[PDB]
Amino acid sequence: SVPSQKTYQGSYGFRLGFLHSGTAKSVTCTYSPALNKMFCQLAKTCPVQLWVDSTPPPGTRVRAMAIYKQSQHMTEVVRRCPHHERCSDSDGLAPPQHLIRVEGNLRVEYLDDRNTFRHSVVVPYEPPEVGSDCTTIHYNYMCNSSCMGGMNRRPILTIITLEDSSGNLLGRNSFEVRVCACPGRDRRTEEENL
Ligand SMILES: [Zn+2]
């Protein structure tokens, strides 16, 4: 089937935020508010912020999953291409087929859905620090959008879900993603078409 991608702030006022990085040649990750699209480099740190109005109960978890944006590819599971799947970039935690990984969190958990076969990565939800207003999760995309045999130029969306310790849905948000070599340039160019 196909995972829901409907925005749902829920009772905790769950929202996503991103760094305002700009489009200079040096940027490794930059978000476009106009396109609700993230442009980032392969395996590089991609900061995604979790903003809430109320602190979720203990045991709450955060899940990330990718799905193809185009309706004619939506049913196809998003996974790494043969090359990167076989490439030796393993961190010892993430399965080799998974596109999305989380770095700097030893409590990260990966899942191959037994029924839908969709891949996803989840971490415990942690309240914002003192003086801090949001929680930051560092994601890494282990395949380029252009990868032959993988996404193969097909656009993807990343769906972030907030769930309780039992898996019940608490909140949902999403954004488009493009993994490329020059995020800044690519973002600036796609926004010109506006
Ligand atoms: Zn690849």
Side-chain angles (χ1 to χ4, degrees), residues 75-92:
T75 66
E76 190 180 309
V77 175
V78 174
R79 62 171 75 270
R80 304 178 78 190
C81 69
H83 167 56
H84 279 121
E85 177 191 306
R86 219 189 180 303
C87 187
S88 298
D89 47 40
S90 171
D91 62 2

Side-chain angles (χ1 to χ4, degrees), residues 42 80-81 83-84 142-144 147:
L42 193 153
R80 304 178 78 190
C81 69
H83 167 56
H84 279 121
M142 311 305 296
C143 252
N144 281 309
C147 274

Side-chain angles (χ1 to χ4, degrees), residues 20-31 39-41 44-45 180-188:
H20 312 303
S21 305
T23 54
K25 181 181 180 180
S26 61
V27 303
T28 47
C29 183
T30 184
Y31 172 78
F39 299 74
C40 60
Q41 291 184 305
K44 296 285 182 290
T45 304
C180 55
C182 282
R185 176 191 65 191
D186 281 35
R187 174 181 164 201
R188 197 180 300 176

Side-chain angles (χ1 to χ4, degrees), residues 41-116:
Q41 291 184 305
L42 193 153
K44 296 285 182 290
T45 304
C46 296
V48 174
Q49 314 175 333
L50 311 178
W51 292 66
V52 293
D53 298 323
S54 313
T55 301
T60 291
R61 312 210 294 162
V62 193
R63 187 181 302 278
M65 174 188 293
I67 67 163
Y68 283 111
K69 184 191 171 189
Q70 299 165 295
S71 63
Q72 58 279 189
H73 295 149
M74 213 156 270
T75 66
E76 190 180 309
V77 175
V78 174
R79 62 171 75 270
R80 304 178 78 190
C81 69
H83 167 56
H84 279 121
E85 177 191 306
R86 219 189 180 303
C87 187
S88 298
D89 47 40
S90 171
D91 62 2
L93 301 175
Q97 291 196 306
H98 287 212
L99 167 70
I100 310 176
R101 298 183 184 175
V102 165
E103 53 167 331
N105 199 317
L106 295 71
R107 302 162 69 193
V108 63
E109 175 185 311
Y110 293 83
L111 172 72
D112 279 6
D113 197 280
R114 58 175 299 173
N115 298 143
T116 70

